[PDB]
């Protein structure tokens, strides 16, 4: 295809009205290229409309529609898909389109736009029309299953995946969807069963998801207290070997390199794994896993500033959607060395999530923030902030009442009575300093009168 693109540039340099060369470039872009082909999506497009004034074939209109769908011009893409059915006479008006390729692929594409814009009724109608034109094309059933899964109806998504498997039994995509549905529900047994069913014939970018899921199911137990027992069985060496076997084949899937970096980070080799976190960091962007791995590497190194900056970048590029647990993962890394001298601004950030959510979960961290306030109120001896912080300390003891239900209760059961006994005379110290400052201001007013 590099020589093909060279020959296409030679044909465009020898004649600028090569409709076959522009159609070939549009097809080769629509099949493979997304990043670089988009300006070429211009280049095929601008001449091709000049062809579309001369004659309206469905192939050129469908190619312009697919190029607009891939570029992100969903309006003109939908208009070209509708023109492929309304203006391209050869599709179904007075002729016949081979294999239902002209309409139903269009019935896919804008229907994917129906997936994109939350036009679920129109996308469902387009999938039903594609099923009515031909009972095959289980991928439309897979899109319907993903749409049902997006509604919070993963049983219906599993049923649509079963219908897709009824369309094609040996289909790695539906098996991967069922495996992801099981892995979301903590169903590693069924996930391994789906990977065994996929791994019979298939491999190579449809089995590497299964190896990655096996490594992920090992890492999910590595992050838990059962990881000692898994440490007895050496699951990390198996995950490292699986990651090495996956990385030996791939050269553009950075998820395997990120998994290998995480597996190195979980052992004592983390000082090299961050360098692997450098290499995936050298790779392409728009991957929250790389920033999360760099934040985790900074948190393991006790460099909380860089981990906080990485969490802030991840939230700046991801916070649009369901990332309400990443704030707690940012706040968890501020108390990894018994630190309470950097949780002053964290007191507003950790409780700054939304006006609709639960707060019972992170109460311990909230106590570990309020104790930081209980550090500063004893040092600052200025009134009108001491006793308010003592009231907030009583509120932190009311949160300790939930923290008790585990040695953190043993720590804060000392700290509650200790901080109350300190406040008993610190409020009188604050009122004494108030008296002294009022003495000073009275003396200054007397000097002004003199």
């Amino acid at each position: 295809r590099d020589i093909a693109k060279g020959h296409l540039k030679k044909v465009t340099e020898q004649y600028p009205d090569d409709v076959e060369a522009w159609i070939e470039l549009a097809q080769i872009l629509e099949q493979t290229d997304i990043q670089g082909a988009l300006s070429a999506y211009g280049t095929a497009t601008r001449i091709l409309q000049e062809k579309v004034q001369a004659d309206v074939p469905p192939e050129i209109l469908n190619n312009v529609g697919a190029l607009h769908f891939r570029l992100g011009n969903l309006g003109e893409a939908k208009k070209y898909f509708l023109a492929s059915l309304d203006r391209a006479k050869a599709e179904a008006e007075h002729d016949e389109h081979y294999y239902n390729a002209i309409s139903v692929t269009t019935s896919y594409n804008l229907a994917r736009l129906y997936e994109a814009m939350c036009e679920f009724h129109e996308a469902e109608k387009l999938y039903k029309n594609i099923l009515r034109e031909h009972p095959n094309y289980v991928d439309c059933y897979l899109r319907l299953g993903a749409m049902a899964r997006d509604k919070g109806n993963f049983y219906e998504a599993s049923d649509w995946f079963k219908e897709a498997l009824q369309i094609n039994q040996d289909h790695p995509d539906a098996w991967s969807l069922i495996g992801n549905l099981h892995l979301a529900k903590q169903e590693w047994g069924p996930g391994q069963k789906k990977f065994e069913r996929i791994l019979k014939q298939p491999s190579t970018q449809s089995d590497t998801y299964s190896m990655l899921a096996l490594g992920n199911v090992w890492l999910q137990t590595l992050h838990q207290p059962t990881r000692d027992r898994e440490k007895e069985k050496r699951h990390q060496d198996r995950a490292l070997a699986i990651y090495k076997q996956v990385l030996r084949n791939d050269a553009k899937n950075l998820y395997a390199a990120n998994g290998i970096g995480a597996v190195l980070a979980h052992k004592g080799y983390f000082r090299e794994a961050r360098d692997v976190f450098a290499q995936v960091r050298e790779a392409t962007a728009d991957i929250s896993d790389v920033w999360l791995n760099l934040a985790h590497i900074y948190v393991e190194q006790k460099q909380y500033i860089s981990a906080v900056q990485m969490y802030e970048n991840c939230l700046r590029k991801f916070y649009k959607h369901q990332n309400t647990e990443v704030v707690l993962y940012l706040a968890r890394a501020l108390f990894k060395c018994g630190k309470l001298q950097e949780c002053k601004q964290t007191l507003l950030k950790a409780r700054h999530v939304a006006p609709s959510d639960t707060v019972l979960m992170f109460n311990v961290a909230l106590v570990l923030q309020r104790l930081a306030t209980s550090v500063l109120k004893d040092e600052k001896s200025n009134l009108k902030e001491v006793l308010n912080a003592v009231k907030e300390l009583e509120l932190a003891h009311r949160y300790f009442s939930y923290l008790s239900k585990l040695a953190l209760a043993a720590t804060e059961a000392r700290q509650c009575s200790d901080l109350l006994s300190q406040a008993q005379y610190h409020v009188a110290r604050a009122r004494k300093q108030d008296e002294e400052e009022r003495e000073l201001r009275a003396k200054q007013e007397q000097e002004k009168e003199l």
């Binding site: 050298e282 962007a285 500033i305 900056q309 970048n313």
Partner: protein, 148 residues
């Protein structure tokens, strides 16, 4: 080690008001990670660069991972593990100005380090937390590397 700054930058623009010198051009670039600004004078003859290109900077205090802070003296022959062996374009200069967003009462939020590599100028303009270890009249190395 000793690493004053570490980022990947992307050429948003080349010298806007024409070019004044025929070998060296003021390239402007932004950041992905830290979202800060750079203006830099590289010479085009031995190290060409185009618009939209992407590269990595390591502003460092010494060229050795040992952190020895040796000299300002040039020895052509030194059998030591150097940091410059990994990188394409390397310069050496002294930072001459630090400008801030500071005021009378509050501290500074944004900083602007200005440094001359023998006459080739550079402005690095971000926030005070990242522009931390820069001190005026400190010798410094540049260490660019072009990445695809």
């Amino acid at each position: 080690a000793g690493i004053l700054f570490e980022d990947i930058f992307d050429v948003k623009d080349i010298d806007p008001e024409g070019k004044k010198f025929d070998r060296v051009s003021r390239l402007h670039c932004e950041s992905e990670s830290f979202k800060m600004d750079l203006i830099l004078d590289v010479n085009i003859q031995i190290y060409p660069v185009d618009l939209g290109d992407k590269f990595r900077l390591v502003i460092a205090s010494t060229l050795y991972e040992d952190g020895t802070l040796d000299d300002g003296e040039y020895n052509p022959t030194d059998d030591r593990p150097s940091r410059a062996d990994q990188f394409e374009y390397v310069m050496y200069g002294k930072v001459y100005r630090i400008e801030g967003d500071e005021t009378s009462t509050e501290a500074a939020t944004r900083l602007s380090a200005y440094v001359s590599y023998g006459g080739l100028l550079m402005r690095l303009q971000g926030d005070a937390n990242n522009l931390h270890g820069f001190e005026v009249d400190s010798r410094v190395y540049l260490l660019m590397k072009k990445l695809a």
